[PDB]
Design a protein around this ligand. Structure first.
Ligand code: 4TE
Ligand code: MN
Ligand code: MN
Length: 325
């Protein structure tokens, strides 16, 4: 009898004619909360589509916020899916009236990286002009190989799915500028003076980052409190001082930068006299750091950063870096 066969009844949320909808996203978040897996065909469809969307973007996303329009900027999330859901509960779901920017490092370290990245990609498809993803140093092959994401994708899906993730990450833009005044990138500024927005737009980004150069710096550099630059403590890119930030901002007619890429106990830091802000959105990082996290609110008519701090929420018993080397 027809009632006795089973096909895809029990395999979870499905796209609507291959497309992301709000209902799908709500179903997906619940499915993931309950530690279940998105059907591989749906994951594939999300990846192919988001690759297409991202590949049409400039390396520098340039966004205009009208006077009364707001946006939220989040820093690193590192596969802390339950904390990601908490951000949406604290700050509202993404929408055309509640836009978000996630400033890189979505994956690795935390062991729900697949759930974070597919949720973020789903929202990018749903609200392509109001949900922004910028590349971090962890959206790269070398980092994924060591720090969990490659292992996690291979465990949950296959090596072929991982290859596709790698290709998609290559199209993530490297920076975003709001109203010609606030520049957002994962890492920071440059190992030499005189770089302008033109240079960022010119980066052919669909690749793994070079060992040095502007693409490397955007993903890897850190501020230092003293003037000038130093070779990075990380062995990649540089540390840049307040004079570097100020010269860059002045030449480019910008007010300040928002970057991520470093943990802060309070979830954020205001440095370089207000010119360099760090936002970090992974509370109690790797279940050990004990840090608060934050996200930033901004408005078209007032682009000053307003910080909202939050703390970690419970998650299932999977250890951080369970999938790592
Ligand atoms: C220790 C954490 C601070 C930042 O996130 C983690 C680390 C990491 O991503 O490996 C840093 C980075 O973004 O490079
Ligand atoms: Mn990070
Ligand atoms: Mn980083």
């Amino acid at each position: 009898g027809a009632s006795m066969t089973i096909e895809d009844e029990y395999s979870g949320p499905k796209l609507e004619d291959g497309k992301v909808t709000i209902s799908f996203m709500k179903e997906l978040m619940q499915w993931y909360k309950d530690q279940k897996k998105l059907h591989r065909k749906c994951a594939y469809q999300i990846l192919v589509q988001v690759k297409e969307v991202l590949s049409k973007l400039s390396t520098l996303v340039e966004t205009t916020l009208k006077e009364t329009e707001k946006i939220t900027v989040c820093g690193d999330t590192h596969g802390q899916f339950y904390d990601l859901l908490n951000i949406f509960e604290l700050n509202g779901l993404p929408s055309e009236t509640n836009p978000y920017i996630f400033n890189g490092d979505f994956v690795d370290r935390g062991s729900f990286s697949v759930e974070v990245i597919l949720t973020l990609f789903g929202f990018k498809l749903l609200y392509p002009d109001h949900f922004h993803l910028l590349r971090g140093n962890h959206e790269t092959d070398n980092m994924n190989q060591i720090y969990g994401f490659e292992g996690e994708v291979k465990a949950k899906y296959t090596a072929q799915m991982y290859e596709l993730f790698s290709e998609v990450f290559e199209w993530l833009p490297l920076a975003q500028c709001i109203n010609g005044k606030v520049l957002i990138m994962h890492g920071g500024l440059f190992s030499e003076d005189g770089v302008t927005l033109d240079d960022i737009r010119k980066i052919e980004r669909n690749r793994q980052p070079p060992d040095s150069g502007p693409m490397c710096d955007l993903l890897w550099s850190d501020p230092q409190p003293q003037n000038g630059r130093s070779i990075s403590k990380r062995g990649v890119s540089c540390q840049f001082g307040p004079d570097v930030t100020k010269a860059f901002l002045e030449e480019n007619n910008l007010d300040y930068i928002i970057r991520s890429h470093e943990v802060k106990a309070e979830g954020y830091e205001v440095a370089h006299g207000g010119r360099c802000v760090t936002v970090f959105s992974a509370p109690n990082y790797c279940d050990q750091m004990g840090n608060k996290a934050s996200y930033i609110h901004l408005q078209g008519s007032d682009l000053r950063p307003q910080f909202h701090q939050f703390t970690a929420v419970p998650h299932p018993n999977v250890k951080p870096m369970a999938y790592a080397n």
